[PDB]
Design an enzyme around this catalytic site. Structure first.
Site, short mmCIF file in Angstrom:
data_model
loop_
_atom_site.label_atom_id
_atom_site.label_comp_id
_atom_site.label_asym_id
_atom_site.label_seq_id
_atom_site.Cartn_x
_atom_site.Cartn_y
_atom_site.Cartn_z
N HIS A 40 0.80 -1.24 0.00
CA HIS A 40 0.00 0.00 0.00
C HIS A 40 0.83 1.29 0.00
CE1 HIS A 40 0.21 0.26 4.59
NE2 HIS A 40 0.10 1.54 4.32
N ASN A 54 18.25 12.16 10.50
CA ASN A 54 17.36 13.36 10.41
C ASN A 54 16.95 13.40 8.93
OD1 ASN A 54 16.31 16.06 9.88
ND2 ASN A 54 17.30 16.78 11.63
N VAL A 57 17.65 17.03 7.11
CA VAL A 57 19.04 17.60 7.06
C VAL A 57 20.01 16.64 6.42
CG1 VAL A 57 21.09 18.38 8.40
CG2 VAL A 57 18.74 18.96 9.16
N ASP A 84 0.19 -7.64 1.98
CA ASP A 84 0.68 -6.22 1.85
C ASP A 84 2.22 -6.19 1.87
OD1 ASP A 84 0.63 -3.44 1.80
OD2 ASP A 84 0.07 -3.29 3.88
N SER A 172 3.15 1.66 16.48
CA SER A 172 3.71 2.22 15.24
C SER A 172 2.47 3.01 14.77
CB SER A 172 4.13 1.09 14.22
OG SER A 172 3.07 0.16 14.08
N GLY A 175 3.04 6.44 8.46
CA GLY A 175 4.40 7.03 8.21
C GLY A 175 5.46 5.97 8.50
N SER A 177 4.55 2.96 8.15
CA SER A 177 4.01 2.06 7.11
C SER A 177 5.09 1.57 6.20
CB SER A 177 3.01 2.76 6.18
OG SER A 177 2.30 3.70 7.00
N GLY A 178 5.16 0.29 5.98
CA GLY A 178 6.19 -0.27 5.08
C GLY A 178 7.51 -0.61 5.77
N1 LIG Z 1 0.24 0.06 14.57
C1 LIG Z 1 -0.77 0.74 14.09
N2 LIG Z 1 -1.79 1.10 14.85
C2 LIG Z 1 -0.72 1.09 12.72
C3 LIG Z 1 -1.34 2.27 12.28
C4 LIG Z 1 -1.27 2.60 10.93
C5 LIG Z 1 -1.77 3.68 10.25
C6 LIG Z 1 -1.39 3.51 8.93
C7 LIG Z 1 -1.71 4.34 7.84
C8 LIG Z 1 -2.70 5.32 7.98
C9 LIG Z 1 -3.03 6.16 6.92
C10 LIG Z 1 -2.41 6.00 5.70
C11 LIG Z 1 -1.41 5.05 5.51
C12 LIG Z 1 -0.79 5.04 4.25
C13 LIG Z 1 -1.47 4.90 3.04
C14 LIG Z 1 -0.79 4.97 1.82
C15 LIG Z 1 0.58 5.19 1.80
C16 LIG Z 1 1.27 5.33 2.99
C17 LIG Z 1 0.59 5.26 4.21
C18 LIG Z 1 -1.08 4.18 6.58
O1 LIG Z 1 -0.14 3.18 6.42
N3 LIG Z 1 -0.70 2.41 8.85
C19 LIG Z 1 -0.60 1.84 10.04
C20 LIG Z 1 0.02 0.67 10.42
C21 LIG Z 1 -0.02 0.29 11.78
CL1 LIG Z 1 0.78 -1.27 12.13
CA LIG Z 2 19.35 13.46 6.60
#
Ligand SMILES: NC(=[NH2+])c1cc2cc(-c3cccc(-c4ccccc4)c3O)[nH]c2cc1Cl
Ligand SMILES: [Ca+2]
Length: 223
Positions: A40, A54, A57, A84, A172, A175, A177-178
């Site tokens: 995703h 950082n 920077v 995923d 987590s 952000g 994510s991945g």
């Molecule tokens: N540990 C958790 N509670 C958790 C929360 C989120 C929340 C996200 C998430 C929320 C909105 C958008 C994206 C997203 C969609 C497309 C590209 C990048 C991020 C997310 O991955 N992913 C998550 C993965 C996890 Cl384990």
């Molecule tokens: Ca940097």
């Protein structure tokens, strides 16, 4: 990462930032030319940023490399987020050293109770958005399958596992994510989804990498 701590520059050498003019997802370096992230997080125009601490920077140790191709798992289901996982091939190989290094794929899946390290530049607030400049870390255990399915009834497949704290506070978030979930030096998970961040009884759900090792190896081998 909510309730985590500052990792310290370059203490997580396999962590990468996927960038399209801003940081949008994390990923893990598994060899000098390939990164694993979540499906995703796919988009075109991705620049992989290695050796970062950082992200706003240039401090030195950074290697910015464009992705040559991204391979989303063929059976990825955007509605359930089953499978995923995505592989990204880099246009050129990265120079590995101590600050940039790859992480190993597992040979077996991990058990509940295993303590793992989750890292990333995702949101640090459960209620609101606060994105950090440096890399955050969190140590979290893998939960039992029963606790995971009890939290997310009907939404957990065999390619997912939960890790975290049911009391809330540490987790987590978007952000992150991945990015990586490393246990005993092996990449066991990928930050995938969850209900909110750090909410009570709503742990994070991660892609179970041990189920994809043959796929990753066969795919890399043929590309
Ligand atoms: N540990 C958790 N509670 C958790 C929360 C989120 C929340 C996200 C998430 C929320 C909105 C958008 C994206 C997203 C969609 C497309 C590209 C990048 C991020 C997310 O991955 N992913 C998550 C993965 C996890 Cl384990
Ligand atoms: Ca940097």
């Amino acid at each position: 990462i909510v309730g985590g701590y500052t990792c310290g520059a370059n203490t997580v050498p396999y962590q990468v930032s996927l960038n399209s003019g801003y940081h949008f997802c994390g990923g893990s370096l598994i060899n000098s030319q390939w990164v694993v992230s979540a499906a995703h997080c796919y988009k075109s125009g991705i620049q992989v940023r290695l050796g970062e601490d950082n992200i706003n920077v240039v401090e030195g140790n950074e290697q910015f490399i464009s992705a040559s191709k991204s391979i989303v798992h063929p059976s990825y289901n955007s509605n359930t987020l089953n499978n995923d996982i995505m592989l990204i091939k880099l246009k050129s190989a990265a120079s590995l050293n101590s600050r940039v290094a790859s992480i190993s794929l597992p040979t077996s899946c991990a058990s509940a109770g295993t303590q793992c390290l989750i890292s990333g530049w995702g949101n640090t607030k459960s209620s609101g958005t606060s994105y950090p400049d440096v890399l955050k870390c969190l140590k979290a255990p893998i939960l039992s399958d029963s606790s995971c399915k009890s939290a997310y009834p009907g939404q957990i497949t065999s390619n997912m596992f939960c890790a975290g704290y049911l009391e809330g506070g540490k987790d987590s978030c978007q952000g992150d994510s991945g990015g990586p979930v490393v246990c005993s030096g092996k990449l066991q998970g990928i930050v995938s989804w969850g209900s909110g961040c750090a909410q009570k009884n709503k742990p994070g759900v991660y892609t179970k990498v041990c189920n994809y090792v043959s796929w990753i190896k066969q795919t890399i081998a043929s590309n």
